[PDB]
């Protein structure tokens, strides 16, 4: 059967433009009723365009028409959604899909290509801003301890949570690095570490701001 493949994940500014390709594999592109769909992140979906099998028309949703566009390439078997002039609600996942598939033999069902999550913000990537989670004194030697790292005023996209190299695999609490008022990210995420090591040992947090070039791994400790 055919497989649909999104262009990873992406970030472009408001008032700038984004093009998302979808590769299709096993079999070629033109045979497929390619369609594209928005999702507000973790919320409802919304349409934006697609090839009808009537006329081959790459029609668009009126709420986005002209500003959203579609195009295609057979040489790589990529469909494309191109959305110009980005706005507040365009921090969406964009999904590739098609009611077709084929296997030389003809077929008609609607599989989906996982879709590119995108961020849109006015922010930019920044140097060091990593801190350990200094405890409350009831965590220090408690029924369970808890420990980790804190982050502020940074905007790389990716980040690593686990709070030591290989020693921790339970009691973890990750969160989606939420935006500050300035549009930079912030992060706290929490691991219930062993009650012996908190106050007596130090670990490490791999909080590397990749595109800043400032790839920092920093010590995890009470102080």
């Amino acid at each position: 059967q055919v497989q649909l493949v999104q262009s990873g994940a992406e970030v472009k500014k408001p008032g700038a433009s984004v093009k998302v390709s979808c590769k299709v594999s096993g079999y070629t592109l033109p045979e497929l009723s390619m369609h594209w769909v928005r999702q507000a992140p973790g919320k409802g979906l919304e349409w934006m365009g697609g090839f009808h099998p009537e006329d081959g028309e790459t029609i668009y949703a009126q709420k986005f028409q002209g500003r959203v566009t579609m195009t295609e390439d057979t040489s790589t078997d990529t469909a494309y959604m191109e959305l110009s002039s980005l706005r507040s609600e365009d921090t969406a996942v964009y999904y590739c899909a098609t009611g077709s598939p084929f296997g030389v033999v003809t077929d008609w069902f609607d599989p989906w290509g996982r879709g590119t999550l995108v961020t849109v913000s006015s922010a930019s990537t920044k140097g060091p801003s990593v801190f350990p989670l200094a405890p409350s004194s009831k965590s220090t030697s408690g029924g369970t301890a808890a420990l980790g790292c804190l982050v502020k005023d940074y905007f790389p996209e990716p980040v690593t949570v686990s709070w030591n190299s290989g020693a921790l695999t339970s009691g973890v609490h990750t969160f989606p690095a939420v935006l500050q008022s300035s549009g930079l990210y912030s992060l706290s995420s929490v691991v219930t570490v062993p009650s012996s090591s908190l106050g007596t040992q130090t670990y490490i947090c791999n909080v590397n701001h990749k595109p800043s070039n400032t790839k920092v791994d920093k010590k995890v400790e009470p102080k």
């Binding site: 033109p30 045979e31 099998p53 009537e54 081959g56 030389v104 003809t106």
Partner: peptide
């Protein structure tokens, strides 16, 4: 010798020289 085959005409329909 499976030839390749004729899809829906809306994208043009032709054999692909097998595949």
């Amino acid at each position: 010798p499976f030839l390749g085959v004729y899809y829906h005409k809306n994208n043009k329909s032709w054999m692909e020289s097998e595949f």
